[PDB]
Write a protein that binds this DNA or RNA. Sequence first.
RNA 1: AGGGCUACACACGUGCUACAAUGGCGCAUACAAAGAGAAGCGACCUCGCGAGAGCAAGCGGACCUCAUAAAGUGCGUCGUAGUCCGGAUUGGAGUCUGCAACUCGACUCCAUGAAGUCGGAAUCGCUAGUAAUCGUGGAUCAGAAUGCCACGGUGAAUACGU
Lengths: 62, 127, 290, 79, 98
Amino acid sequence: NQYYGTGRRKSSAARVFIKPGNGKIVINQRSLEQYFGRETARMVVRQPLELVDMVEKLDLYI
Amino acid sequence: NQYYGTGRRKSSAARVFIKPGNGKIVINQRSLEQYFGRETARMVVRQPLELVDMVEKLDLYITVKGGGISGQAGAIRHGITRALMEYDESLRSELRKAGFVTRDARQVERKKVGLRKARRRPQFSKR
Amino acid sequence: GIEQSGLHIWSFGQLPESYEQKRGNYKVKAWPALVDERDSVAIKLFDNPLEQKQAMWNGLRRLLLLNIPSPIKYLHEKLPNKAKLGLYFNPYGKVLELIDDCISCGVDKLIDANGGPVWTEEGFAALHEKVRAELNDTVVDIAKQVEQILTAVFNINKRLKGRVDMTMALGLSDIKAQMGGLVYRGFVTGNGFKRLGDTLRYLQAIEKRLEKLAVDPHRDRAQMLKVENVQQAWQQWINKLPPARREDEDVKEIRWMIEELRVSYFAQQLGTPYPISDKRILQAMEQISG
Amino acid sequence: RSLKKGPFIDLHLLKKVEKAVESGDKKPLRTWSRRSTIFPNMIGLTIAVHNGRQHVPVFVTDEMVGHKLGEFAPTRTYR
Amino acid sequence: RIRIRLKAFDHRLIDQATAEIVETAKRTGAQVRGPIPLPTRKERFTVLISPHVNKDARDQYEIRTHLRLVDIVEPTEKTVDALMRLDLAAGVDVQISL
RNA sequence: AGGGCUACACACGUGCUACAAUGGCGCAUACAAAGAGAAGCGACCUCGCGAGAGCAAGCGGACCUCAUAAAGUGCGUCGUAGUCCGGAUUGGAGUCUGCAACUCGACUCCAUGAAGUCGGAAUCGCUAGUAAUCGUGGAUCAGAAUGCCACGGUGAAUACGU
């Protein structure tokens, strides 16, 4: 029950793996609070989930 | 491989199953002499079978639901006259000629406003 | 002819543990047992001692309830009528078959307390006199505990039926599944005397689920994800086993392990007989995968 | 015929009747509640029941107690 | 196992409701039992049309409440999370019994 | 707040029930449709002769309840008698609703047993599932229908003709 998505930008690549959960997110084996320090980056990582209100339905290994 | 028909009548509808046999009839898991044999309409259920040939040489499991006694009997009647459709137009023609393939169109109709019943108007007085 | 039919009284003496004959060079083995006929008892041959034991067990229950002078009508007469209305809480409706099942749950409890099924008429009489002297009054506990578990079923039914929301209905579907797993046709003889208290604990956990359910789906959602994952693990593990290993008892306690896990998630004021976590269910399953 | 559980009286009529009979018969008691039932403590007393315009006085004997106040006061006057 | 019931006054509108429900259910799940129709609550009224006289001058009306069932068999969290927040129909209401 | 709208020498309207044997009564027995229900319909069990009462589920309802459809049929009986017809009226005693039933509810138990043996002048409705007859539900409504609106059962006769 593991599903796959990929994301590419200028010189970047992200692999994301979906679990049903409660709303925990881990990037590169650290939390997003000790990761990205800029709040609009927090906005752009939450905004797909916040658009379709699955924001605490799942967990996601990124 | 089973003769089948469905007949309808006033507030009633019947499912009839017929197979080649030797004369038995079963209505709602009961016998015809038990279910109509003590009152009227015990003969309308059988009579198309005596008019058509092979009167003994079939046997039939029939059921009927809804309506009263004569409505149920007429439903059985129309169901049988349909259910012999596997026997072809060679006897369907004379069956319609006797006038039995037609579904009866009569139903009890509604009470109206300002009327005691169907058409009986309350008494008109004083002119 | 040891193998007969229409039998009603243990005149068999020392019933054969095994049957053996010889044909030419080689022997032929079998296992004779009793058979329930719902009217009487028979004796039939079998080819496996375990299913022989089950068949003789069933026929012994039928023979015992026939030889005891009316424990069925005795318990019908002496049973409390408020308890009988608690039995009338049955969605199935019939109460006489429920009392039949509870008397059977008395009978296997007393046979287990006396040391299991025996082959001899002396053991038959030794168990029979005691189940006469004690069966008529030990099943009052079974009857009142079925009354209590039916009051639990009553309360959980009055919670599940009615105005329901889909955020509730996620939990209520699993509650329905647990209800179907626990209560069924003859559930008291289905689970046995040793598990009747544990089922009351299970319905206490079912009760304690709903207060957290009505205030927060999400914590309930995550814990039901945990239960769901161990449940699908249970299905995919128990469905690959050999068919005897799909019906044995040692593979049968893992459902009760999952129910104790449900207790350990939702109602820890009640407790479990032993500490249990998902790691413990998995170490159990790869421990007994064989 | 009526409530079995308690033949009816008005509360103020009950307390007026008690404060009349315990103090003795001294004044004809005027009242409106025809719905009330006559009791044995009322026997020998004089009541003045409303018929719509005035009060008809009634004396209370033994067999009054099976009947109510309203039967002894016609309000429709047919000549 | 999930008994989905719809009540409306407009049979057309409740067909577009049932079509949405059954199509989303087939889309993200399995084993629908179709849009089960039930006998309409056919509720009968008659009142007077004159304000004072004419007992025989009346008018007759009715309510046709249409019923539907769906009965999803597998209550999978995926398909119920899809079927929620997406029914959104104007003139129906919903029962979700177990 | 009470009374009155419910009175009474009378006249008229529309209906209900009868004057019976094509029936009255007892036992047994078969077949419908449609509608209602949450301050609601209210199973089952128990009490009473019953109205109902105690307990009390199920049912926001193709599930549960109202709900036993009744005329119909097979037996036994009455026997043409105001008669086992009809039930008015009246007396006692109760059941429910509602703060409360006298004016001024409905219903049940017992007892009573009118008038009435098919009705003048005249006059009404009805052309087929119709007339006639037999029950059932609803709205109003706490309680209150022989009223009104629906539902089905059996089931006609006659129409030459203007």
